[PDB]
A paper describes a structure:
To address this need, we designed and characterized a series of boronic acid-based inhibitors of colibactin biosynthesis. Using biochemical assays and crystallography, we show that they engage the ClbP binding pocket, forming a covalent bond with the catalytic serine. In this structure, the d-Asn side chain of the inhibitor projects into a tight-fitting pocket and hydrogen bonds with the side chains of residues S188, H257 and N331. N331 also hydrogen bonds to E92, setting its orientation and helping to enforce ClbP’s selectivity for d-Asn- over d-Asp-containing substrates. The inhibitor-bound structure of ClbP also reveals continuous electron density from the S95 side chain to the ligand, indicating essentially complete conversion to a covalent protein–inhibitor complex. This boronate complex is a structural analog of the tetrahedral intermediates formed during amide bond hydrolysis and participates in several stabilizing interactions that are likely relevant to the activation of precolibactin. The backbone amides of Q330 and S95 hydrogen bond to one of the boronate oxygen atoms and are thus well positioned to stabilize the negative charge that accumulates upon formation of the covalent bond with S95. In addition, Y186, which is part of the catalytic triad that defines this enzyme family, is positioned to stabilize this complex by donating a hydrogen bond to either the other boronate oxygen atom or the oxygen nucleophile on the serine side chain. Thus, the potency of these ClbP inhibitors arises both from their ability to mimic the hydrogen-bonding interactions of intermediates in the hydrolysis of precolibactin and the formation of a covalent bond with the catalytic serine residue.
Numbering used by the authors: 36 to 411, 430 to 491
Amino acid sequence: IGAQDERLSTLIHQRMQEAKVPALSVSVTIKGVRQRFVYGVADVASQKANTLDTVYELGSMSKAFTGLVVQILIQEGRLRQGDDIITYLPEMRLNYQGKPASLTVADFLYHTSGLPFSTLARLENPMPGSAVAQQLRNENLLFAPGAKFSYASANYDVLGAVIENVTGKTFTEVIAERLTQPLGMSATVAVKGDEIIVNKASGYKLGFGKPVLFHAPLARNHVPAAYIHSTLPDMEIWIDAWLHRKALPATLREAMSNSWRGNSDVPLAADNRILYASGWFIDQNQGPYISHGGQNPNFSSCIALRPDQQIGIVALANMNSNLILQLCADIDNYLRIGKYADGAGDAITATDTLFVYLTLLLCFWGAVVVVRGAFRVRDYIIALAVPGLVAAMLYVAPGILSPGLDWRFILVWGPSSVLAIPFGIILLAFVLTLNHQI
Ligand SMILES: *[B]([O])([O])[C]([C]C([N])=O)[N]C(=O)[C][C][C][C][C]
Ligand SMILES: [Cl-]
Ligand SMILES: [Cl-]
Ligand SMILES: [Cl-]
C-alpha cells in the first residue's frame, strides 16, 4: 500500500476545527485500503486522548442495527413485515381519527407510522418500570399509517420492543448473539442505562462559544433508536460486512439484502425522491448511495456506503454538530470528483451566538437600570411577584406554543446558554420592578 491522503486529512481537520468537536474519528474504506483519521480528546478535563478504543454513542445509526435484526427475525420466519404491531405490543393503542389504527411492523421500519414529534421527548426520558407500549398508548397519529414518510426516532424503539417480544431475550442479548458476536464487533453493545462504559468518550455541547461537558439522558427504551455504543474499528467491520456478505451466514446475507430495500410506497417531494429502508437512506443518484446520520444531544456521527465502488465512510464525534452530519457527504464528494463544498451551518451554533447577544443585551439593560438607580414590605412583596409571574409565564410557554414540548426537552437539545435566557428575562424583570419601586 501507500500513505494516507493529505488532501483528505486537511478536509477533516478543517471540518473538525469548524465544528469545534473535542474528538473526531473518521474511517474511509476504498476497496480494502482503509484510511484512518483519529484526532482530539475524548475527555477534555482529564485530557484523555481520542484513541481507537474510544466508544461513541451512534445516535440514529443505531437504527440500522435494530432494523437488520428485524430482518434476521423475518428471514427466520419468526416475524413478518406486514404483521400488526398489536400482535407483539398488545397494549399499544395508537389513534387515527379517534379509532385504533392498524400499524404494521413495516410502518415503524420505514417511518410511515404517524407518531407525533413529541414521542422523542417521551422515549428519551428515563422511566424505569414503563414499557414502550405504555409510553405511546393513546397517541394521536399525524396521518393514516402508511400514508407519508415522516421520520420519528421512536419508531425504532417500538421495534426494539418487538425484537424483545419475539425472541424472549433482552435487546442487548439479541444484538450480541445476532450481530456483534457473529461479525466480530467485539467492542459494540446496546446499553441498558447510564451505567459506566469503559472508554466511552465524554459528551459535549456548545455553550457560550466553547464545548461544555454534558451528561445526557440515556433511557433504556430509547437504545434501539439512539444509544448503541461502538468504536471506529468496529464500525469498520460493520462497513465491511455490508460490503462483503459472501463469508457471512445466509440468514445474515439475506437479512442484509432486505435491509437495503427502500420503501417506494410513500409520496415523494419535487427535490427529494430518496427512499428509506431498514435504518438507511437509499439514493440512486451517483449511487446506490446508502447513508444515515447520527445525532444525539452530545454525540453526532455519520455513515455512507457506495457499495458498487467498495466505498465506506464513517465519522464519530463526541459533540452534536451538522459539520459532522455532513462530513460523509464532504468525503464522498472528495472521493468522487476531488472537490467539496464549504462547511454548512450548524443550528446549535447559531442559537448559541443568538443567546450570547441576548444575554449581553439583557445584561447591558440591567446595569443601566442599576447604575441610574443606585446613583439616584409592599416594596419587597410586589417586586418579587412580578419576576415570579414572568418565571411562571416562561415555564408554561413551551407546552403552549408547541403542545407536547417542555423545558426538559429544550435543555437536553439546545445550547448550554438556553438557561441564561429565562433567568436573564426574569432577573431583568426583578431589577425593573425594584427600580420602578424606587
Ligand atoms: B437520529 O435521527 O439521529 C435521532 C437519534 C435520537 N437521539 O433519538 N436524533 C434526532 O432525531 C434529532 C432530533 C433533534 C431534536 C431537536
Ligand atoms: Cl433468538
Ligand atoms: Cl437486565
Ligand atoms: Cl464480496
